[PDB]
Symmetry: C2
Subunit: 151 residues, 2 copies
């Protein structure tokens, strides 16, 4: 079962990439890979040995993931260090897909209130850019929609 | 027609916040809103005054947008400088939804193959971290699906 070092390698590379895709550092994604596979919390030093990277590259990557919400800090009785663990991957996505949806909609609504007053022949001037923000809404309704079809 | 400035400020505020949720700098989203709202390619300097930020905050934000592929350099005849312009928004999201899907897909394919060999009673051991990566597949299929339901 050298198999498992292989399944590990794959997963870690998947996440590294994806992260490079969302405009983030490969590590951030590399570190979440480690945690995603871990069945127990891991400290900074732990993660450093599993990926072999400075203490800082690990700390930042962790910092990015706490911002995002995929990772949270964990406290172990009798322990001085700060542990970490991967939040339920998919649930944390739902949350994001929903914040992004309430934000985009709130904007599309406010943008509508300004089109209330801005009317007549000018009401049409705004319709260019509002129709882009109006798509942004139809997209997160489904990306949300599709998300509440898997639970 | 201050309204416009008002709508401007909405859209800029909308994009600043979607960059801070995707773990990016608020600038990275503000910048996109300038090029998003503009009808012509701008220069780094043009945007600075548009958002009143440093020549570094703009360069920061613009290299990332190019990375993520929402903005692309543009050249003007008789102009020593560089110009930037947002790319076709939603098109640039179709492309990202596929890369992710093709990375996820592949890996999920490759994870099976290791489960081909790794079998019997252990074939069952792999099934934990796999059903996670299998979910991510069904998700990028719909957010993909959904995106190919708008054109």
């Amino acid at each position: 079962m050298i198999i498992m070092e292989e399944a590990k390698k794959l997963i870690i590379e998947l996440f590294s990439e994806l992260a490079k895709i969302h405009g983030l550092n490969k590590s951030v994604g590399a570190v979440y890979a480690i945690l995603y596979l871990s069945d127990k919390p891991l400290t900074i030093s732990d993660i450093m040995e599993e990926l072999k990277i400075s203490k800082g590259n690990v700390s930042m990557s962790l910092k990015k993931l706490e911002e995002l919400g995929f990772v949270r800090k964990v406290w172990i009785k009798g322990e001085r260090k700060n542990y970490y663990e991967a939040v339920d991957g998919f649930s944390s996505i739902k949350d994001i897909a929903k914040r992004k949806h309430d934000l985009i909609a709130k904007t599309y609504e406010d943008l509508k209130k300004l089109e209330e007053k801005c009317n007549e022949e000018e009401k049409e001037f705004i319709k260019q850019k509002i129709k882009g923000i109006e798509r942004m809404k139809k997209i997160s309704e489904k990306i949300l929609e599709a998300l509440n079809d898997l639970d």
